[PDB]
Amino acid sequence: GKTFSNVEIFDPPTNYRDPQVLYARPLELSDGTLLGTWENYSPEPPNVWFPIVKSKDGGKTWKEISKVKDTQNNWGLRYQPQLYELPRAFGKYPKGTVLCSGSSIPSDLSETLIEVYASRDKGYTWEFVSHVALGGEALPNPGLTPVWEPFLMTYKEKLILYYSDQRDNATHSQKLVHQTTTDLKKWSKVVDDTKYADYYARPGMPTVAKLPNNEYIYVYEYGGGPNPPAGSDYWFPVYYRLSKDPQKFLNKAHHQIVSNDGTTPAGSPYVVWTPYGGKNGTIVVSCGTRSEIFTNQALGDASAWKKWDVPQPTAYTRSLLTFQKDPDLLMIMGAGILPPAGGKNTVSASVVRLSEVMK
Ligand SMILES: OC[C@@H]1O[C@@H](OC[C@@H]2O[C@@H](O)[C@H](O)[C@H]2O)[C@H](O)[C@H]1O
């Protein structure tokens, strides 16, 4: 069988710091191998690292094959890891190089630094590549200037790195931006992807997927979005935008995700698209406060969102991956909840079939 539920990837030592683990991310390589990483809250020193686990049987079993370490700052690689495989060469880094981006942060949380590291041997060894974005104190409070949450994607001859940015702290509590590169060393000026005029709004957590009508869907949580539910005065509903040019979401109309039964997903979303289910494929979205997946088989039409149960539990920024040799297969991977986590977080995954789940 290719499907499985709740297979454990990592059970953290008892001495790891709340939340112990968080922010799981998967990656499929062109040879079918899977890589996985997460925020790894070990007792320091040594400075924290991003572990790299590898599966050769479609995620049934896993083994750690390396650690991505901060070799530049004597801080550690601490938050918001993101794995990505180059689909083409950039500068001296050929097609098939594995990138691991993430934020390097000293233990005292006084600064944030989004880095790119590269592996030329499919995840066994790593080398620093470049510093992308420096920010201030790593607490999500209005007025601080941190940067967070890198997400990578290619577009033609460019690689784009999307992230969350609090540096414009006289105008936006947080906004969403990107930089681009053609060689993985020189990065463009910051470009805005999504921002709202009320200072207290905090759009965050960008992820992106390519649709088969040559548009891209750009998904994020809209901190401070309208109509918080009774008894809340600030929430993080999931919104998205559509654009033929993925450098230009800023000027595109936004849409909230709401399923046909009225469910409003919120918190730390993650989107993928898979060439399965019909001529438009299937867009799949997870959010960080519910266990279901949300699907759209109409290229992001706002009235076509569906919702389906899966056996993988709710988790912060629960992530998604679709298998290139079988688009019907969906991996859902998580590393538990935001602290306080009560010592309960583990890193785990399920593989489901959209054909079975979508009934
Ligand atoms: O990833 C660990 C997590 O990051 C910090 O918050 C960042 C905050 O999270 C999103 O919801 C927003 O885009 C961003 O400002 C937390 O302090 C830490 O637990």
Side-chain angles (χ1 to χ4, degrees), residues 232-250:
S232 163
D233 88 301
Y234 194 96
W235 74 324
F236 296 81
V238 180
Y239 271 65
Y240 63 100
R241 299 176 180 209
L242 300 167
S243 180
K244 176 133 316 188
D245 178 332
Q247 305 162 101
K248 298 186 198 201
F249 294 114
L250 187 56

Side-chain angles (χ1 to χ4, degrees), residues 14-15 20 23 27 31 128 134 137 163 198 203 212 215-216 227 248 264-265 293 297 307 334-335 352 357:
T14 56
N15 67 5
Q20 308 194 292
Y23 211 114
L27 170 67
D31 66 9
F128 169 70
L134 178 61
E137 182 176 1
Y163 59 95
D198 184 289
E215 305 212 317
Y216 291 81
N227 302 136
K248 298 186 198 201
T264 56
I293 59 177
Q297 284 178 336
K307 164 176 79 93
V352 308
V357 158

Side-chain angles (χ1 to χ4, degrees), residues 19 22-23 39 41 78-81 109 138-141 146 148-149 164 166 174 176 202-206 221 236 267-268 316-317 338-339:
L22 199 75
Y23 211 114
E39 293 178 356
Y41 289 79
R78 195 173 304 278
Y79 286 171
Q80 300 131 19
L109 302 190
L139 293 170
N141 299 342
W148 328 87
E149 295 151 355
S164 302
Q166 301 194 211
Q174 185 171 277
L176 294 170
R202 300 175 55 85
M205 311 195 70
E221 64 181 7
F236 296 81
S268 64
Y316 186 66
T317 196
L338 286 161

